[PDB]
């Protein structure tokens, strides 16, 4: 459900920068990055990344557990419109099916394979 | 805008 | 154009000192100060403020001024979204019509009438 | 990053 950018910054200047950023940077995607409000995981210090496109959904979880400090008995699930994704997909085409109106992908963590229960 | 990209690497 | 307050906080985290700091000082507004670029002034040494909401713009210009040292035939002016506010509004109603999604408000300073 | 606290 809520994802912090959202509220953060007006959809008006997201989605106007979701579509200059698509021109500048033809090779990556845009994506936002949160903790779900009930996972009991680090926050991130950024949430906001241009991610290549042929990277998998498997290497770009890899990078965000690094960049979350986690222990490796530490969980992680990401959540993408309320699912799990598969991690062979590459990011790209996860992008494209999944993007919001705004023009940017938004993952949601947590340490629990349930979202926002 | 506002809010800086992490621009990872390719 | 561009604070430097803003390269250094990710929006994320002068946004957290934003909003934890309105609940906390509820008759204060958090206020960045910096020197415009081709400002011929001296730097100020802190750049950011809690500055009581019914202060005048006109109080602050003159707490500004004694900050950086200026003699008083020097002058200054400050910018807030390009325009040079009128002495006359409270820090408070400059805020509230001015602030940043960080719930900050910017201020430039300058000794020209023009910026950037 | 700490704030300088003006009085009225
Ligand atoms: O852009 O890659
Ligand atoms: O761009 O790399
Ligand atoms: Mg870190
Ligand atoms: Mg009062
Ligand atoms: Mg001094």
Redesign the interface.
Known sequence: MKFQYKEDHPFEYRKKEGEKIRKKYPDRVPVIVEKAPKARVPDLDKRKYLVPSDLTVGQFYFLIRKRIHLRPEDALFFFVNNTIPPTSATMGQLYEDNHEEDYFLYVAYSDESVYGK | ?10
């Open positions: 805008e506002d809010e800086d990209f992490e621009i990872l690497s390719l």
